[PDB]
């Protein structure tokens, strides 16, 4: 399991635009509860929690804090029993 608490900024001359952009981004992240890691649509980043702190600085800190997790699988395989054979005696 790989977890990341990724923080996001939004900058603009119009602060109300910052509020609107953060609102739509949050709603998108929530209603679509995961994100395509790559265009192959193999992996996904299932959301855990998205939180905004409007008081936080626009540039240094960043308004929106999101936590994503992903579950890998150890890449190991082995030989397979395609064919089985045996005889009978007494």
């Amino acid at each position: 399991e790989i977890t990341k608490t990724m923080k996001c900024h939004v900058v603009s001359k119009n602060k109300d635009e910052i509020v609107k952009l953060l609102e739509t981004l949050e709603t998108s992240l929530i209603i679509d509860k995961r994100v395509r890691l790559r265009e192959d649509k193999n992996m996904y980043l299932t959301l855990v929690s998205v939180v905004e702190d409007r008081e936080s600085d626009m540039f240094t800190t960043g308004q929106l804090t999101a936590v994503f997790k992903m579950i890998g699988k150890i890449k190991r395989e082995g030989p397979t029993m395609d064919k089985i054979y045996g005889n009978g005696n007494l």
Binding site: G78, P79, T80, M81, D82, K83, I84, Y85, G86, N87, G88, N89, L90
Partner: protein, 420 residues
């Protein structure tokens, strides 16, 4: 399920058909050897017909007389192809001119008798669907309501007899067709020609590589004495192949050992794994040549299934196979036909296990242990049922040491209950 290659004029050519607990001529094996197959009381019999290539179907054409110029409206044919004189008499009905009597004859005895009105469809449906029309098929020419002509004893001809020429290719047709079917056993129809028996040996060997261990039965010719019978038995050494030794009587025929093999195969299939014919009574009234202890031992050791009238009824002295001339690694218990069929059944069940555990499982010690444990539990279940008395199923180390990643080998050995 016994596959019988009937040398008969009756039955369908080139096709497999089954018959429930329900030919007739003594020359046709559908009744001469069909009776032998049925007397062993297999749950059902499956038939195949051997015929010369120069053999076709009989055809009779009939024409109307309602109009002045006669035209064909009905054509009649034998149910199966044949040249048999299946004669048909058609006359105008005594009361109504619109109804035509149809009297059918096997040769000349009255088989079916009825009259139907002038419409062709009713006549054809009657002639095809009535209970006594088992020996004819009738087909329409065209839609009509005219009235046939008067004809007596019209013989359907154009084909040939089913016993025209018993030859190697004609016999091999049966094996070629039976390749697409699986049976408990297959038998040869009396013809103790060693070429045919060797061809069937090769065919069954090919199936053994494929795994279809159809239990074969054969027999020597009427001209084989004890020496010839033993030599022919020694010629074969296969596990699933048998050579009945002595001729027999049931009603009237000196059935060859090969002809007797039909009833022997039926009994062997009927008995199943549970039943063994090593000391079982048989339907036959007598069998020759007779065998004393020395003759019995010589024939059994040579690989012959000995039948003797050693008591008030015929007795199969032992249920032995051509592998009774065994070799050192396999014990004499391998040489019993019931044991071989038992081995084949276990092979089929373990093949079901094989296709249960396909390569989804890894080729590691864990997967091998899983498969071996499944087989061990299967043999434990059989032992609980009582058939097995001991078992040891293990990794086939000799073949598994050189096994590639994809392939796995195993082997089983088990002791079985004896019957004296």
């Amino acid at each position: 399920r016994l596959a019988m290659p009937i040398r008969a004029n009756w039955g369908d050519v080139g096709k497999v058909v089954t018959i429930k607990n329900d030919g007739d001529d003594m020359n046709y094996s559908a009744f001469k050897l069909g009776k032998l197959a049925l007397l062993g009381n297999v749950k059902e019999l499956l038939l195949y017909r051997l015929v010369d290539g120069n053999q076709k179907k009989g055809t009779l054409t009939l024409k109307d007389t309602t109009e002045n110029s006669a035209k064909d409206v009905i054509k009649l044919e034998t149910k199966y192809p044949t040249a048999r004189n299946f004669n048909v008499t058609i006359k105008s009905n005594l009361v109504d001119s619109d109804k035509k009597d149809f009297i059918f004859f096997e040769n000349t005895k009255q088989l079916f008798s009825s009259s139907i009105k002038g419409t062709i469809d009713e006549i054809v449906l009657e002639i095809n669907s009535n209970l006594d029309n088992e020996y004819v098929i009738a087909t329409k020419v065209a839609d009509s309501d005219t009235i046939l002509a008067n004809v007596v004893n019209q013989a359907l001809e154009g084909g040939n007899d089913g016993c025209t020429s018993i030859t190697n290719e004609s016999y091999l047709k049966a094996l070629e067709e039976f390749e697409r079917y699986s049976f408990d056993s297959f038998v040869l129809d009396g013809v103790a020609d060693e070429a045919l028996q060797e061809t069937t040996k090769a065919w069954v060997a090919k199936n053994k590589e494929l795994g279809k261990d159809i239990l074969l039965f054969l027999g020597g010719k009427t001209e084989d004495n004890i020496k010839q019978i033993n030599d022919k038995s020694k010629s074969f050494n296969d596990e699933n192949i048998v050579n009945v030794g002595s001729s027999a009587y049931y009603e009237n025929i000196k059935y060859t050992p090969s002809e007797v093999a039909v009833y022997i195969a039926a009994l062997s299939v009927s008995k199943g794994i549970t039943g063994s014919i090593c000391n079982a009574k048989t339907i036959f009234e007598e069998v020759e040549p007779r065998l004393s202890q020395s003759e019995v031992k010589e024939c059994l050791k040579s690989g012959t299934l000995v039948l003797d009238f050693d008591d008030g009824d015929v007795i199969i002295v032992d249920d032995v196979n051509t592998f009774k001339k065994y070799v050192d690694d396999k014990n004499e218990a391998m040489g019993y036909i019931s044991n071989i069929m038992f081995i084949n059944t276990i092979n089929k069940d373990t093949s079901l296990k094989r296709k249960e555990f396909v390569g989804k499982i890894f080729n590691d010690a864990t997967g091998q242990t899983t498969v071996i444990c499944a087989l061990k539990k299967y043999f434990e279940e059989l032992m609980s049922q009582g058939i097995i008395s001991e078992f040891n199923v293990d990794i086939d180390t000799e073949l598994q040491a050189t096994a590639k990643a994809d392939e796995f080998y195993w082997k089983w050995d088990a002791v079985k209950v004896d019957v004296m």
